[model samples]
Target: RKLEVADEAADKVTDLKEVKHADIIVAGNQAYVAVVLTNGNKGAVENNLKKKIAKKVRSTDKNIDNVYVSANPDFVERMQGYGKRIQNGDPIAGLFDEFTQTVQRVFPN
Candidate 1:
């Protein structure tokens, strides 16, 4: 990752106010899909997604849980496939581990 330094100052935090936080700007390729999945509120879903997706995409990129309905028909279909695949077991349990991993990954700055 390319870290940007503002104004070539010493890379030390003297004042908390002078510190700038950086994170990946999530470009959800499917805005409407997030809306539908998160219930019509874009902001709420976006917030939830930032917390969730960062963990998942960072993990071995594995099926962290039931596949979310991607903003595309193809993704929805894939999620459906995951649903069917996990019908015999507890699919939702994976979400707990996923959430914990996400929070832990970004802990304490």
Candidate 2:
């Protein structure tokens, strides 16, 4: 049920001009979205960017109960590394726990 929304939620985030790209991993009720901004957009706007992303991704599916979205350069870099692992055929289930914990650190609210 959770895995179903990953790609669609990712698409919704990346469609925004504020985001360079997003890597999303869906697990249980949480949607972990890591966004990389183009040109390091202002912090004030980035605040709203997170809200906009939560709304966008949550609306993608009824099952999404919580959205943890991070745009910090530090956060996105970690996710990008995981993306490489997935591309190289690493197990997604193995990645989900680590990914989720990382997202929680940034998007605790």
Candidate 3:
């Protein structure tokens, strides 16, 4: 179920420009969509994107209880550094791994 939700959220993230990376963390009834922007910091555009994605996710499944869209350039930079160190065959995979753990620690599922 979580995987499916993540997939759906991922598709939405892909459609957006300046999105360097995106991942979803589902803890209970909450869905946290972690987005890394390649361009500017968190501004109106980012806020709008968050609302848009949250709406899409909720519209798809009302059971999602909570939908959170987070955008942070600093987090993205840290992840990129960690990604480089891991040097996995897939950068996204490495970043996703860290993202999942980070979210877990922060949100405490």
Q: What is the C-alpha lDDT of each candidate?
A: 0.28, 0.72, 0.58
Best by lDDT: 2
lDDT of 2 by residue, 18-108 (tens): 7778887667777777776776752423667778898889888898888777666777788677767776777778776777677667766
| Candidate 3 Cα misplacement greater than 4 A, ranges | 1-5, 18-20, 38-45, 73-109
lDDT tens readout by residue for model 3, 1-109: 2322255656666676666566664545777665666675654345677776777666656677787665655544544454344443444543566666665654454
For candidate 1, lDDT tens digit of each residue in 1-109? 1111111111111122222221121112211111123232322224455444434333422322321212333333433333343444544465435433442342323
Backbone clashes (count) for model 3? 0
- Which has the greatest TM-score? 2
lDDT of 1 at 5: 17
Candidate 2 residue pairs in clash (backbone atoms < 3 Å) = none
| Candidate 3 residue pairs in clash (backbone atoms < 3 Å) | none
